[PDB]
Each structure stands twice: as structure tokens, then as C-alpha cells.
Ligand SMILES: NC(=O)C1=CN([C@@H]2O[C@H](COP(=O)(O)OP(=O)(O)OC[C@H]3O[C@@H](n4cnc5c(N)ncnc54)[C@H](O)[C@@H]3O)[C@@H](O)[C@H]2O)C=CC1
Ligand SMILES: NC(=O)C1=CN([C@@H]2O[C@H](COP(=O)(O)OP(=O)(O)OC[C@H]3O[C@@H](n4cnc5c(N)ncnc54)[C@H](O)[C@@H]3O)[C@@H](O)[C@H]2O)C=CC1
Ligand SMILES: Cc1ccc(CO)cc1
Ligand SMILES: Cc1ccc(CO)cc1
Ligand SMILES: [Zn+2]
């Protein structure tokens with residue numbers, strides 16, 4: 065009944081940095097060729113959405129943010145082949161065009177059609193499908209999931225299991241798949257190893273889950289907020305350390321605890337200092353350190369390259385290293401088969417209209433993931 | 439006949455930074471338990487020896503430098519089981535104790551008994567075997583090969599093929615093995631890949647040899663000294679570029695030449711700027727960059743961690759990642775079986791007492807490796 069029509073709906077518009085979202089009426093254009101219009105069912109609040117509000121992550125404003133979500137296809141544009149109206153879908157903040165040199169590489173997942181390197185905040189055709197107060201509103205990572213309806217390019221959506229519980233599997237759209245893959249795919253954590261995970265929010269907890277699945281013997285969670293430790297242990301942390309409790313720098317503490325450095329370290333915060341600390345705490349000859357945290361816009365870190373010359377490996381990754389459109393349906397199939405759990409990441413559930421309370425819960429330290437329901 | 443006796447011989451002593459080597463009469467103590475005294479046959483001049491003169495590489499002075507060598511065991515201390523008098527041997531500037539967590543790890547080669555991380559310039563027991571007019575002279579990297587005789591710890595020497603030509607296989611003690619391993623073991627260059635090699639000295643030429651052996655399709659050599667290009671192309675470079683020829687940064691030139699970044703890059707100079715340039719020029723989703731060059735003492739580089747979050751891998755290694763005592767004999771056996779060539783690296787052969795002429799040749803840019811012969 066809305067097919068081929070402009071939809072008027074509620075969305076959370078960010079007009080300026082460091083301001084609350086404005087819940088207001090937007091107009092959502094119908095999909096053009098190779099585009100898909102999705103009725104949102106559930107969206108998580110990721111720290112990367114908050115980085116947009118803070119200006120730590122730069123993307124054009126005004127914007128509809130939100131990138132961790134699940135919904136049901138309302139309609140398809142001409143030429144769409146991979147989803148149909150009524151399908152359950154997760155939007156892909158990292159697309160999979162299937163055509164570019166990265167998509168064709170066996171170990172690449174950062175498709176060259178992404179809007180993350182040089183954000184334009186548009187559809188692939190350089191235009192917006194959102195109007196508010198008669199003005200065009202930017203898209204966010206090709207997703208924009210803080211709206212009752214969104215329009216995505218076909219390369220930025222995956223069809224999932226028709227019986228999927230969308231109020232859980234939204235997390236497969238970002239935080240779970242990012243942390244889990246950071247361990248199983250990017251670091252390739254080995255059986256019997258010692259891991260260190262810096263940051264025990266939803267992504268860091270998912271890194272722990274992946275380290276445990278990979279059979280790590282020791283998983284040391286590190287967080288300045290000791291209220292994060294109990295859940296970190298529930299999902300597999302063998303020990304938790306608060307840097308604030310020690311006189312020595314934490315890389316020194318972790319190097320001692322692991323009898324000369326950890327096998328695998330993960331930076332899951334987004335601070336330059338912890339990126340260098342996490343590198344430093346992995347064993348100097350054969351340690352691996354993964355950057356998962358999104359750093360503050362345009363800022364460089366400083367480091368001593370003797371950290372690498374001894375033998376360390378340093379790497380980072382988007383979305384866990386997963387090829388998004390191949391991986392997300394498989395991840396949902398595994399979730400349905402109970403190969404991993406998402407409920408440990410969900411601490412709060414709120415209606416969409418309470419999005420600003422959801423951001424307050426994240427900022428205060430109280431939540432892991434809040435799931436917003438439409 | 440000299441077993442158990444002090445040996446009076448000539449060595450090249452570095453008394454002061456930025457001064458010529460001084461040929462001195464030194465006394466070489468007989469080897470103590472688990473020590474081996476070696477008569478030198480040939481030693482290469484590596485840019486790392488020059489980094490001691492320049493103060494780039496800090497080690498206690500006065501010192502007998504030299505680390506890339508081959509010779510014949512003159513005598514063994516109590517308990518030595520791995521070499522006998524008369525054996526051909528290569529000193530190992532990276533030891534292999536076989537007992538530390540690194541030596542037991544399948545990948546690691548930076549044995550914890552090394553004198554590279556915080557140089558002391560001694561034997562394992564904390565003393566020196568060298569005196570000059572009553573004054574103790576420091577060891578360098580547990581090798582000290584700029585001497586007619588040296589004493590090394592048993593963990594810092596490998597027995598090699600009795601038939602091997604010492605005037606060639608001395609390069610297995612450092613520059614050949616470093617560059618070749620960096621490519622074949624550390625980076626794991628793949629068939630049909632595009633590689634970029636920064637620095638076309640003996641170590642960079644050995645990285646090109648390794649890239650070619652691994653079946654790279656394109657090997658781009660980068661050097662500010664265009665006299666290095668002919669020999670780079672002889673050992674497998676498909677193209678050479680001089681950053682001084684271009685009115686834009688070489689990382690942009692190489693990204694354009696490689697249609698959006700190279701598979702594998704190697705920094706084989708020892709400059710912080712080229713370390714970052716080399717990382718940048720590898721493809722942002724799946725590229726790998728290896729630091730080989732020794733950085734200037736205590737200096738940090740600056741870099742944008744978004745270079746790694748996209749998917750790059752950054753690593754470094756000592757001695758090409760080879761477990762020294764295991765690998766050296768097998769590299770020499772491979773040379774004897776014509777699996778690789780060393781003559782392309784050797785531009786000059788001088789007697790030992792002409793060491794300062796050999797360093798002048800390196801500094802002028804004329805030579806790749808000068809071999810000093812005894
Ligand atoms: N690479 C990617 O594809 C993805 C990256 N990210 C990023 O991952 C990071 C984590 O995201 P969430 O888990 O949602 O965030 P979060 O804010 O829930 O978790 C971060 C944790 O770090 C802790 N923390 C803050 N400063 C600390 C310090 N100095 N030392 C130790 N712990 C510290 C906090 O107390 C918090 O528990 C963020 O930077 C986010 O932007 C999120 C998902 C995808
Ligand atoms: N990681 C390890 O185990 C080892 C490290 N090293 C290091 O590897 C490096 C190379 O050693 P060699 O091959 O013996 O030295 P080399 O001096 O023969 O070769 C270096 C080359 O870099 C080029 N160069 C200098 N500045 C440049 C610039 N700005 N841009 C591009 N090219 C530049 C020079 O013209 C020269 O050909 C040194 O830093 C040495 O200390 C050497 C062997 C062991
Ligand atoms: C660079 C970057 C931006 C946003 C996200 C989504 O969490 C990931 C990575
Ligand atoms: C750090 C370092 C010092 C010396 C050598 C020998 O070429 C390699 C690496
Ligand atoms: Zn693609």
C-alpha cells in the first residue's frame with residue numbers, strides 16, 4: 065500500500081554535533097533502481113553512533129544515524145534480485161558489491177563502495193532519499209537505521225532467515241559480528257592462547273566470545289569501569305584488570321601476568337593511547353594486536369617502530385573482517401542454531417521514541433546494548 | 439695448539455661514534471663453558487654496522503662490531519655439543535637458546551637471550567673476552583666479527599656444510615637471510631602479487647630475490663639512488679622508481695601504479711617516513727607491510743590508525759623471521775643446491791685491514807656488500 069509512494073514517518077534527525085536527536089517527521093522517497101526500502105523493526109545503539117554526535121567520527125550533518133539494525137523489506141526498486149517485499153533483512157554498513165578488487169580478494173571485506181573512508185552521507189548515486197523540514201538529510205554509512213523506514217542500496221542489505229528474532233539479530237549488523245570476527249577471523253585466536261581485550265562494551269564482549277569460541281586458555285578483560293567485569297567474566301573473561309588499580313602502566317601489568325606478553329591483544333575503545341598500549345602488551349616476537357576502536361577524526365598516534373621490528377603484528381579491521389552480505393545470513397543461521405548468544409549483550413530495551421534515554425544509558429556507563437523497537 | 443690460551447690478534451675497534459675503525463692489537467680470552475672461539479674467514483659490511491658508527495644504533499662503546507660472517511672453530515669451551523674444532527660456522531646475531539617461550543613458539547625467532555632490545559655488549563655471562571691494552575672492549579650482538587678471532591656463546595653459532603664457500607655464505611649470517619625471509623616467511627608473498635621494496639641495498643635486493651622466488655608478478659623497487667636500479671632489475675625488480683623524480687608523494691605514485699595499492703610492501707632503509715609511506719602504499723583492505731629497516735634510536739613515528747582499521751597488516755622482523763640456529767644450516771645447504779644466488783649482492787672484496795675503505799664504499803653509495811677476507 066506504500067509501494068511507489070513517499071512515506072511520511074518518524075526519524076531521529078541529528079541537526080548538529082553534541083545535541084540530542086530530534087524525533088520528527090521525515091519524508092522517505094521510494095526506492096530507485098537497485099534500491100530497497102526497509103521498515104525498521106529493531107536498532108541497537110553502538111558507540112559509533114555516539115561518535116557521530118560527539119564529532120569523533122565525521123560524517124555530513126544533518127544526518128539520520130543508526131547502522132546496527134534489522135527490518136522487513138517494504139518495497140524494492142527495478143532490478144533488485146537478492147531480496148523481496150516481506151523479507152527480513154539486515155542493513156550492511158560495510159557493503160559487498162561483489163565486483164571490486166577487495167570483494168574478489170579472499171581476505172578483503174572493505175568493499176570500495178563503502179561510505180566509511182571518505183563519508184558523503186548519500187546513496188550510491190550521490191543523492192538522498194530523506195527530506196525533513198523541506199531540506200535533504202544525509203544518510204549514514206549507507207544504512208540510516210534511526211528511522212521508521214530507510215532506503216538502502218542492494219549491495220548494503222542482506223536477506224536473513226524468515227524466522228529470525230529481529231530484536232536480537234540486529235546486533236549481527238554491527239557490534240557482535242565486529243567483535244566476534246575480530247577474534248576468529250582477523251586475529252585468528254589459537255587454542256590455548258592468552259588474549260587481552262581492552263574495552264568491555266558490546267564489541268569487547270563479542271571479542272571475548274570469539275576468543276572463548278577459538279579455545280583461548282586465558283582472556284584478560286581490561287576496562288576502567290569495574291562494573292563491566294561481571295558480564296565480561298560471564299561471557300568468558302578468566303580475569304579482569306582495571307588500569308586505575310595499578311601503579312605500573314597496564315602494558316607492564318599484562319606483560320607480567322602473561323609471563324612475557326599476550327598472544328593476542330584487541331583495542332576495543334577508540335583511543336590512540338590504548339592502541340599503543342594494546343600493541344605493547346602482546347609478546348614482542350610473535351604477538352598480534354588488532355585495532356577495532358574507531359579513532360578520533362584525523363588524529364595520528366605516535367609509536368616506537370621497534371615494537372614491530374621485534375616481530376609483532378599490528379592490524380585493524382572493519383566489521384570483524386567479514387564479507388558482509390555473504391556472512392550476515394550465515395551468522396543469523398548460526399545464531400538460530402545457538403552457536404553463539406546475543407542476550408548477554410542486551411541490557412536494555414526501549415521504544416524508538418526513547419532514543420535519547422538510550423544514548424544517556426550508553427554515555428553514563430550503565431548499558432552494553434540498548435535495543436530500540438519501532 | 440692455541441686451545442685454552444689467550445690469542446693476540448688484530449681487530450677493528452670503534453672507540454667513538456662517527457670515527458673510523460681503528461685496527462688494534464687485541465687479546466682474545468679462551469672460551470669459557472658453553473662458548474666457542476672462531477677464526478674469521480669472511481665478514482660482510484652491513485648498514486647496521488654503519489648505524490653503530492653513526493649512533494643510529496646504540497650499543498656500548500668501545501666495541502668490536504661485525505655480525506655478518508663465517509669462519510672456522512678454533513676451540514670449544516667446556517660442555518659445547520653443537521660444534522667442534524675445524525667446523526665451518528656462521529655466528530648468529532639473533533641467538534636460538536631452544537628453551538625460552540619464543541624459541542618454543544612455532545613462528546617466533548627473537549630469542550629472549552638476544553642482545554638487541556637493550557644492548558649490554560657482553561657475552562651471556564655479562565663479561566667481555568676482548569681486551570685492548572688492558573681495557574675491556576665490548577661485544578656487538580653476541581658476534582663481534584670484525585676481528586681475526588672472536589668468542590661467541592654456543593646459542594650464537596651454527597655449524598654449516600664443511601664444503602661451503604665462506605667468502606659467499608657469510609651473507610647468510612645477515613643481509614641475504616633477512617631480506618629473503620622477510621619476503622618468504624614474514625610477509626608470505628603470494629604468487630601473482632604486486633610488491634614494493636623501499637631500499638635497494640643488499641637487504642632490499644634479498645627481499646626482491648624472495649618476492650621473485652615466491653612468484654610475485656610485479657616487484658617495484660624504490661630508491662633515491664638510481665644507480666641501484668640496474669642490479670635490482672637483474673635480481674627481479676620489474677620497475678624501479680626514484681621518489682626524487684616526482685612532484686608528488688611516492689605512496690600516491692605506487693597506489694596509481696598498482697591500481698589502488700600493492701599486496702606487499704617492505705621498508706628496507708631505516709627511516710620513519712619511509713616506514714609510514716610503505717604502510718600507506720599497500721592496499722588498504724588486504725595489504726601487508728613489513729618493516730625491515732632499523733629505525734633511529736629512541737625516535738617514534740607518527741601515523742593515522744585508520745590506515746590499519748581498514749584492514750592493513752603491519753609487522754616487522756629480525757633476521758627475516760628465521761629461527762637462527764635451525765635455519766642457517768638449511769639456508770647454506772639451499773645455497774649449495776643452487777636454490778638462490780649470493781654473487782649479485784657482492785660488489786667488492788677487500789682484505790680485513792681495508793675495513794675503512796669498505797665502509798667508505800658503502801657510505802658513497804657505490805657498493806652493495808663488501809666482503810672482508812682474512
Ligand atoms: N571496527 C569496527 O568495525 C567497529 C568499531 N567500533 C568501535 O568499537 C569501539 C567500542 O564500541 P562499543 O563496544 O559499542 O563501545 P562502548 O563504549 O560500549 O565500550 C567501550 C569500553 O571502553 C571502556 N573504556 C573507556 N576508556 C577506557 C580506557 N582508557 N581504558 C580502558 N577501557 C576504557 C569503557 O568503560 C567501555 O566499557 C568504539 O570506538 C566503536 O566506535 C564499533 C563497532 C564496529
Ligand atoms: N631487521 C633486520 O634483522 C635487519 C635490518 N637491517 C637494516 O636494513 C636496512 C638496509 O640495510 P642495507 O641493505 O645493508 O643498507 P643499504 O644502505 O645498503 O641500503 C639502503 C638503501 O636505501 C636507500 N635510501 C636511503 N634513503 C632513502 C630514501 N629516503 N628513500 C628511498 N631509498 C633510500 C639507499 O640509497 C640505499 O640503497 C638498514 O636499516 C639495516 O640496518 C639489516 C639487516 C638486518
Ligand atoms: C570507521 C567505522 C565507522 C563506523 C563503524 C560502525 O560501528 C565502524 C567503523
Ligand atoms: C635491531 C637490529 C640491529 C642490528 C641488526 C643487524 O643487521 C638487525 C636488527
Ligand atoms: Zn566491493
Ligand SMILES: [Zn+2]
Pocket residue numbers: 110111112113131132238239
Ligand atoms: Zn557499530
Ligand SMILES: [Zn+2]
Pocket residue numbers: 484485486487505506612613
Ligand atoms: Zn646486518
Ligand SMILES: [Zn+2]
Pocket residue numbers: 533534535536537538539540541549550551
Ligand atoms: Zn630462546
